Amino acid sequence: EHQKEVQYEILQKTIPTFEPKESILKKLEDIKPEQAKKQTKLFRIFEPKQLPIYRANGERELRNRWYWKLKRDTLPDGDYDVREYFLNLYDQVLMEMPDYLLLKDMAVENKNSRDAGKVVDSETAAICDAIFQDEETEGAVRRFIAEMRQRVQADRNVVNYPSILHPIDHAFNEYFLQHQLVEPLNNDIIFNYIPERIRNDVNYILNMDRNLPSTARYIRPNLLQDRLNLHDNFESLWDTITTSNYILARSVVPDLKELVSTEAQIQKMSQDLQLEALTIQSETQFLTGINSQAANDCFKTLIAAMLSQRTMSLDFVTTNYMSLISGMWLLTVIPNDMFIRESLVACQLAIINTIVYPAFGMQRMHYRNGDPQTPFQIAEQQIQNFQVANWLHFVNYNQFRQVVIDGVLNQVLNDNIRNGHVVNQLMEALMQLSRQQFPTMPVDYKRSIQRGILLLSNRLGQLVDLTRLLSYNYETLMACITMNMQHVQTLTTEKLQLTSVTSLCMLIGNATVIPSPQTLFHYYNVNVNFHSNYNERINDAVAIITAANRLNLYQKKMKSIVEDFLKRLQIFDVARVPDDQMYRLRDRLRLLPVEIRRLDIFNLIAMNMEQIERASDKIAQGVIIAYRDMQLERDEMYGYVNIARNLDGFQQINLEELMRSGDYAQITNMLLNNQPVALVGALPFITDSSVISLIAKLDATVFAQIVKLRKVDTLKPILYKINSDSNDFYLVANYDWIPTSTTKVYKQVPQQFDFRASMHMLTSNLTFTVYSDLLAFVSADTVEPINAVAFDNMRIMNEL
Amino acid sequence: MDVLYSLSKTLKDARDKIVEGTLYSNVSDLIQQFNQMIITMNGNEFQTGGIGNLPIRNWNFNFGLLGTTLLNLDANYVETARNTIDYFVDFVDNVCMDEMVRESQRNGIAPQSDSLRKLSAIKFKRINFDNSS
Amino acid sequence: MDVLYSLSKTLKDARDKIVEGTLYSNVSDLIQQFNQMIITMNGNEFQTGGIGNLPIRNWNFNFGLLGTTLLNLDANYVETARNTIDYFVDFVDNVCMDEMVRESQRNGIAPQSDSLRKLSAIKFKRINFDNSS
Amino acid sequence: MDVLYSLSKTLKDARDKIVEGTLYSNVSDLIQQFNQMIITMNGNEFQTGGIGNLPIRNWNFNFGLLGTTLLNLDANYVETARNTIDYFVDFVDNVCMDEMVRESQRNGIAPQSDSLRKLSAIKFKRINFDNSS
């Protein structure tokens, strides 16, 4: 068998299931819902700062001026890394962003106000104070700063607070205030949140024993469907998902109560079918009679596989015929979709060659695998009985029936399995095989196989009621399914022992087990939590992929995004995904539209890339080299400075594409032969306050290492910030020379602080409460399980 | 009939909206419908004409999807879009000339050509778009 | 008057765009406007007619919102949409017949019917949509 | 010529779609095109007229972008939008009157005015929008 395990391991290495199959349940029950996040600050990218100004001859004035300086200017160099940093800022905003906002918890007192006054941040209180204290703002403004008043309304649930924000920061905060993902909760929404079968079941008694105020709110789970069809082409991912849903649904189905005492059952089955008279062996026929490790685990296996759409495989011994006789009931209750094709045809052919074709005198069939016709399906066209043929034609076409119920697709039984009426035909077809004389079988094996059929055919009601119960548990747990129930033949199969089926047949009593409403709600909780997790992660993934592609990041390696994506679904072993499914999960995430929330934030960040980049003070975005003495420009910011307004008239050479190509060919030419040019990049610069360095013409000397190194990474040009504080300024002041410089550092001046375009009234609510559980508000009882009824209001477990 | 109007409405809009240099958010909801159209129409073969001097043409659809990763649509995307649009416009032109030419005394409101009887299935129902004319 | 055109433009588009089998991204911006319309119009009662033989009809709006969770619109969504659209179309038909029938010598540019004087408030201003005719 | 139709189509839609009280999702794809238009047209100067009695007008574009942070468009956004739209409408009016007045025997299909010869560059190609008329 050492070949068999290594071939199964070669198959298993490409499947992302975790090797402890029970442990996945922990990793599936520890998917908490995405907690409602509340913000305590106001997302300030910029801040006002006092800067000294220089009145266009060099002299530093006797006052300062407020400007919009970008706090935390961690902007890197080069065109590529700067917009990679804007994507880092995009991810930082997405993980920072609150759902709901209450401005009253951020409201702080306005220290100057002549009544009481409440601004909405400690930093806007500091800005408010500092604009009130200085001697150069307007009298209307300085009067108003101690006259503005919040508007807090106890009715209508609104608050209005003044704020001093940048229009960019105001765009982000007003986006966070308008679009909130929070919305009213009452008893007429919790009533719709539970599934439809449980709403209209008389077995489960649910109502509201708790009050909900008007300030009760929640968050929708986003229970939208797949958008990525994982079932048709992602077979190794679908294997992992069916294993995870399988071990989930296995731990939810109820344990069997009040079974047959196993020793009396084993002795009855050992005296009815005798094996000391026959000779194949004595014992191995009777591994059946186990109380809880065979019948109960078969019950779990059947319902968990049917709920998770996990394909099963049949294990048996062909000489063990009672396993095949119970396999007949397995084939009539479970649809033949469920079992893998070779095991289905193998057990079916075993049942037919050992029981049904020896019955009616017919020669045993040779199957020929290549046909689409199962052995029952050929057999009934070869058998005329009207009693066995009814059973064979049932099992030939019992399969699931695909219908959406409240959006979700569901795999349902027909109503003959559903009320257990089909077993009244299997037992009619089985005791037809019992009054059946076989034409050439030895009589001891014939009497043994007829009495082994009579072991089954005398449990008419005990198995009618068992397949009523099995189907009812499948009903009540199918209602809490929130993803699709797609039936795809999975790779690995959950092996079923037919000995466990014989145990479930011969050991069930009449005690009804139905899922209690706490484990019926908990299954729904973990299904909705996994589906919420799944959709919110896909939205994050298409956000990051679409943002990284619209921001021209092509060293991005989207496989890393998809690897960090599959780690977060918390059921996958990402290092075992095959490369074709990884690249196809990549090119399937790119056909999806971005969530409107993510797309609005990307629009907020994409248009303000230039204002955040060009107010950085660490980088300057390109250098004019003109080779003629263009004159030093007067600026109130810097004094005299070689700052440039446009890159017009000259050549914009992209420095990023120059770094990519590496052929140079041009900047070498235009640098050797002294031709004017404008290098567009995101370089860092040397600020330099020296007139001696201005006369010595230092800026032409920082470009020859571009053709020495053949690298534009070390390009650090020089800004000529000269002023009265530059302690070489007398050469500017005493002599009659015109301020000239060869090259220019293209840079934008920062925006000055205007109080009119920065004061804003922010509006939110007052004191609501979000609720994450949404199902602790349902009080939950059940009818006494002796009185449990089916869909038809007839009692399941009739047998009492 | 509804899906034929839907094919023509998407081809008209994709000649109008998918142009060179336009922003992607202007066409972000049209490219998804056009990709749904390509996904639905692949693997299917049609046969138009066969009455009078209208020639018999066989139609086979094997096209790749359009990209959803640009910010401004460049000329590569416009040229591959113009190829796919010109093939679908020739297809719908011959389907419309195959349908206007036929008639029936029994139930005239039903589609008469083979191509429009094939398009009247629910497999092609996801082609459907707004019905504004 | 602006909100009456907005009601009619959304009802025209929702008869056109909300069809069976269409993709959700084609109608993702219309369903939000139609839900804003339902949210605005609930709890309000109107009274149309009362001049000549135009009969007095009372209008009460109590509707649930439309779902925002499909990928392709199935026939359930289309049938509940057709119900809500038919009620709103009957409402706006009777409001328009109540407004075309009345006149005033004093200031004719003002709304004359009671329903359009009630729709001219800022409570109903969030109904407003594009004004393209 | 394509960008002139695109300017006029966005100005027509932004007079139509950007109104008071309308939902932001109705105009979420138009504001991005109008911001792309503002970003493209800034820093450029134009000169219209100069033939007959058509007066010479100089055009300079220095505008801020429109906000993308409202849920329902309030009247502040509508008034600043109406200002920017009225300036661009006056610009495109004078460009169209400068282009209809000129002609050439050599190649008449080419733009003749200085403003439309300046708009025929690829710098202005990102203005482009749907061509539906």
Burial environment of residue A329 by CB neighbours within 10 A (0 to 12, 13 to 18, 19 or more): buried
The CA distance from C73 to B126, in Å, is 9
Q: Identify all chain B residues contacting C19, using CB atoms and an 8 Å cutoff.
A: 2, 128-131
Q: What tokens were used for B113?
A: 């050509």
Q: Which residues does chain D break after (C to N > 2.5 Å)? A: none
Query: Which chains would you list as touching C if contact means 3+ CB atom pairs under 8 Å?
Result: A, B, D
Amino acid identity of A625?
I
CB of C26 within 8 Å of a chain D CB? The answer is no
Chains contacting A (3 or more CB pairs within 8 Å): B, C, D
Residues 6+ apart with CB under 8 A from A578: A14, A236
- Write the secondary structure of A641-691 as one string of H (helix), E (strand) and C (coil): ECEECCCCCCCEEEHHHHHHHCCCCCHHHHHHCCCCEEEECCEECEECCCC
In the 8-state DSSP scheme, what is residue A792? T
Q: Which site among D35, D126, D127 would you substitute to test the B interface, given the most B Cβ atoms closer than 10 Å to its Cβ? A: D126
Q: Does B39 touch chain A (CB under 8 A)?
A: no
The sign one gets for the Cα dihedral B30, B31, B32, B35 is positive
In DSSP terms, A763 is beta-bridged to A160
Contact residues, chain C, for A407 at CB < 8 Å: 69-70
Going by the DSSP 8-state scheme, the letter that residue A78 receives in this structure is S
CB contact under 8 A, A591 and B71: no
Q: Does B13 touch chain C (CB under 8 A)?
A: no
CB contact set of A111 (below 8 Å; sequence gap of 6+): A125, A128, A129
Q: Tokens standing for B71?
A: 């910010």
Nearest to A607 among D65, D70, D71 (CB): D65
Q: Give φ, ψ of A162 to 5 degrees.
A: -75, 155
B17 and chain D in contact, CB less than 8 A? yes
**Are A562 and A541 a contacting pair, CB within 8 Å?**
yes
Residue with structure tokens 């849920």? D71
Rounded to 10 degrees, the C-alpha dihedral D100/D105/D106/D108 comes to 30
The type of residue at A723 is N
CA distance B126 to chain A (A): 15
**What is the spatial distance between Cα A58 and Cα A725, in angstroms, rounded to a whole number?**
8
Contact in structure between C85 and C30 (CB atoms under 8 Å): no
Going by the DSSP 8-state scheme, the letter that residue A50 receives in this structure is E
The answer to whether residues D118 and D46 touch, using CB atoms and an 8 Å cutoff, is yes
**Cα A446 from Cα A355, distance rounded (Å):** 10
**Beta-carbon neighbour count of residue A26 at 10 Å?**
10
Size of interface C-D (CB pairs under 8 A): 37
Q: Is C68 part of the contact surface with chain D (CB cutoff 8 Å)?
A: no
Q: Which of A224, A593, A596 is the closest to C69 by Cβ?
A: A224
Give the number of other Cβ atoms within 10 Å of residue C96's Cβ.
17
As a whole number of angstroms, the distance between CA B20 and CA D3 comes to 11
Closest CA to A23 of A574, A474, A523, A573: A573
Q: Which residues pair with A770 in a beta bridge?
A: A217
CB atoms within 10 A of CB A614: 17
Neighboring chain A residues of B68 at a CB cutoff of 8 Å:
546, 590-591
Q: How far is C123 from chain A (nearest CA, A)?
A: 15
Q: Nearest-CA neighbor of B82 among B59, B66, B96? A: B66
**B127 neighbors C23 (Cβ within 8 angstroms):** no
User: What are the helix (H) ranges across A458-516?
Assistant: 460-478, 498-507
- Inter-chain residue contact C128 with D21, CB threshold 8 Å: yes
Residue C127 CA from chain centroid, whole number: 8
Query: Is residue C93 less than 8 Å (CB to CB) from chain A?
Result: no
* Pairwise CA distance, residues B96 & B93, whole Å: 5
Strands ordered across the beta sheet of A677-680? A643-644, A740-746, A623-631, A677-680, A652-654
Q: Do C75 and C20 meet the contact criterion of CB atoms below 8 Å apart? A: yes
Residue matched to tokens 């094919």: B7
Task: Answer yes or no: are the C-beta atoms of B102 and B31 closer than 8 Å.
Answer: no
Q: Which residues, 6 or more positions from A767, have their beta carbon under 8 angstroms from its beta carbon?
A: A102, A104, A215
Across the interface, whether the CB atoms of B23 and D2 are under 8 A apart is answered: no
Q: How was this structure determined?
A: cryo-EM
Q: How many other β-carbons are positioned within 10 Å of the β-carbon of residue B106?
A: 5
Identify the contact set of chain A against chain C, taking CB-CB distances under 8 A.
223-225, 227, 404, 407, 593, 596
CB spacing of A607 vs D67 below 8 angstroms: no
Interior angle at CA B102, CA B98 and CA B105, nearest 5: 160
Q: Residue C38 has which token pair? A: 């339902």
Taking contacts as CB-CB distances below 8 angstroms, the residues of chain C near A225 are 69, 71
| Residue found under tokens 């004319």 | B133
Residue of B16, B20, B23 with shortest CB distance to D33: B23
Tell me if A24 sits within 8 A of A17, measured CB to CB. yes
Burial A517-546 (b: 16+ CB within 10 A, else e): beebbbbbbbbbbbbbbbbbbbbbbbbbbb
Decide: helix, strand or coil at residue A175. Answer: helix
N- to C-terminal Cα distance for chain B? 13
* Burial (CB count <10 Å: 0-12, 13-18, 19+), residue A401: exposed
Q: By the 8 A CB rule, do D34 and D66 touch?
A: yes
A170 neighbourhood in chain D, CB within 8 Å: 69
Three-state secondary structure call for residue A584: helix
Joined together, the tokens standing for residue D19 give 């109104």
Nearest to A317 by CA among A342, A354, A359, A291: A354
Helix crossing, A443-457 with A423-430: angle to 10°? Answer: 160
User: Does D32 contact chain A (CB < 8 Å)?
Assistant: yes
Measure B79 CA to nearest chain A CA, in Å.
Answer: 20
Q: Tell whether B32 is within 8 A of chain C (Cβ).
A: yes
Among A595, B36, A590, B18, smallest CA distance to C23 is for B36
Considering only alpha carbons, which residue of chain B is nearest residue D7? B22
Cα dihedral A352, A356, A360, A361 in deg (nearest 10) = 50
- Nearest Cα to Cα of residue A291 among A330, A267, A255, A326: A255
Contact B36 C13 (CB under 8 A): no
Query: Is A174–D43 a contact, with Cβ atoms under 8 angstroms apart?
Result: no
Neighbours of chain D (3+ CB pairs under 8 A): A, B, C
What size, in residues, is chain C?
133
* One-character DSSP codes across A292-358: IIIIIHHHHHHHHHHHHT--EEEE--SS-HHHHHHHHHHHHHS-TTTB-HHHHHHHHHHHIIIIITT
Using CA atoms, how far apart are residues A684 and A715, in angstroms rounded to an integer? 8
**What residues have CB less than 8 Å from B76, skipping those under 6 apart?**
none
> What are the CA-CA distances from residue A7 to residues A10, A17, A356 (Å)?
5, 17, 36
Distance between CA atoms of residues C128 and C110, nearest Å: 18
Check CB contact under 8 Å for C25 and A224: no
Residue A641 · residue A722 · CB < 8 Å: yes
Alpha helices, DSSP H only, in chain C? 2-16, 30-41, 75-100, 114-119
Interface contact A407-C71, CB threshold 8 A: no
Separation of alpha carbons C79 and C82, rounded Å: 5
DSSP track, A208-222:
E-S---TTEEE----
Task: For an interface test with B, give the residue of D130, D132, D133 to mutate (most B CBs within 10 A).
Answer: D130
Helices and strands counted in chain A (H then E): 30, 27
DSSP, res A749: P
Q: CA-based angle B66:C19:A411, to the nearest 5?
A: 85
8 A C-beta contact, residue A110 and residue A131: no
Q: Which residue has the tokens 């191509």?
A: B115
Residue written as tokens 């602790």?
A776
* Residue found under tokens 């008869």: C15
Contacts of A590 in chain B (CB under 8 A): 68-69
Q: What is the DSSP string of A346-393?
A: HHHHHHIIIIITTTTTPPPPP--TTSS--HHHHHHHH---SSHHHHHH
Say yes or no for a CB contact (<8 Å) between B13 and D130: yes
Q: Report the chain B residue with the minimal C-alpha distance to residue D123.
A: B21
- Chain D hits for A600, CB-CB cut-off 8 Å, are 28, 68
Residue A93, Cβ neighbours under 10 Å: how many?
18
Contact A760, A732 (CB under 8 A): no
Output the six-digit token pair for B52.
């009078």
Count the Cβ atoms, other than its own, within 10 Å of residue A708: 9
The DSSP line for chain D is: -HHHHHHHHHHHHHHHT--TT-BGGGSTTHHHHHHHHHHHHTT-EEEE--STTPPPEEEE---PPPP---SB--HHHHHHHHHHHHHHHHHHHHHHHHHHT---SS-TTS--SHHHHHHTSSSSGGG------
The alpha carbon of residue D48 is apart from the nearest alpha carbon of chain B, in Å, by: 25
Contact A546 B32 (CB under 8 A): no
Tell me A736's DSSP state. Answer: -
Question: Residue C25 is nearest to which of B2, B29, B130, comparing CB atoms?
Answer: B29
Tokens 């076989």 appear where?
A: A438
Nearest to A148 by CA among A97, A107, A182, A113: A113
DSSP structure class, residue C72: B
User: What tokens does A689 get?
Assistant: 């306050």
Q: What is the dihedral of CA A338, A339, A345, A349, to 10 degrees?
A: -100
Rounded to the nearest angstrom, the minimum Cα separation between D68 and chain A is 7
Distances, alpha carbon B57 to alpha carbons A360, B88, B115, in Å = 58, 13, 11
Neighbours of A30 (CB within 10 A): 10
Contact criterion met (CB < 8 Å) for C131 and D16: yes
Where are the extended beta strands (E) located within chain B?
Answer: 45-48, 57-60
Cβ neighbors of A722 (< 8 A, separation 6 or more) are A58, A632, A639, A640, A641, A689, A690, A691, A694, A728, A729, A732
Nearest to A553 by CA among B83, B71, B23: B71
Nearest of A163, A37, A40 to residue A106 by alpha carbon = A40
**Eight-state DSSP code of residue A697:** T
Helix (H, G, I), strand (E, B) or coil at A95: helix
Assigned token pair, A796: 């399941």
DSSP state of B47: E
Residues A573-611: b if buried by 16+ CB within 10 A, e if exposed:
eeeebbeebbebbbebbbbbbbbbebbbbbbbbbbbeeb
Q: How far apart are CA A14 and CA A37, in angstroms?
A: 38
**Length of chain A in residues, anyone?**
800
Give the number of beta-carbon pairs within 8 Å between A and B: 16
Could you give the CA distance from residue A703 to residue A627 in angstroms, rounded to a whole number? 13
Interface touch D22/C129, C-beta < 8 Å: yes
Alpha carbon distance A195, A206 (integer Å): 12
- Cite the beta strand spans of A511-635 per DSSP E: 619-620, 623-631, 633-635
Q: Compute φ and ψ for A686, nearest 5 degrees.
A: -95, 110
Q: Distances from the Cα of A268 to the Cαs of A262, A296, A464, in angstroms?
A: 10, 21, 21
Give the three-class secondary structure for A56: coil
User: Which residues of A touch chain D, with CB atoms under 8 Å apart?
Assistant: 167, 170-172, 174-175, 178-179, 596, 600, 603-604, 607, 646
Residue position matching structure tokens 């001859």: A57
Residues in B closer than 8 angstroms to D128, CB to CB, are 19-22
The dihedrals phi and psi of A656, each to the nearest 5 degrees, come to -70, -50
Yes or no, beta carbons of A549 and B32 under 8 Å apart: no
Residues constituting chain B: 133
- Pairing verdict, β A769-770 and A183-184: unpaired
* Phi, psi for C61 (deg, rounded to 5): -115, 110
DSSP class per residue in A227-292: SS-TTTS-HHHHHHHHHHHHHHHHTTSPPP-SPPPHHHHHHHHHHHS-SSSS-S-SSGGG----II
Q: What is the DSSP string of A386-444?
A: SSHHHHHHHHHT---EEEEETTEEEEE--HHHHTTTTHHHHHHHHTTTTS---SSS-HH
The residue ranges of DSSP E strands in A582-622, in sequence order, are 619-620
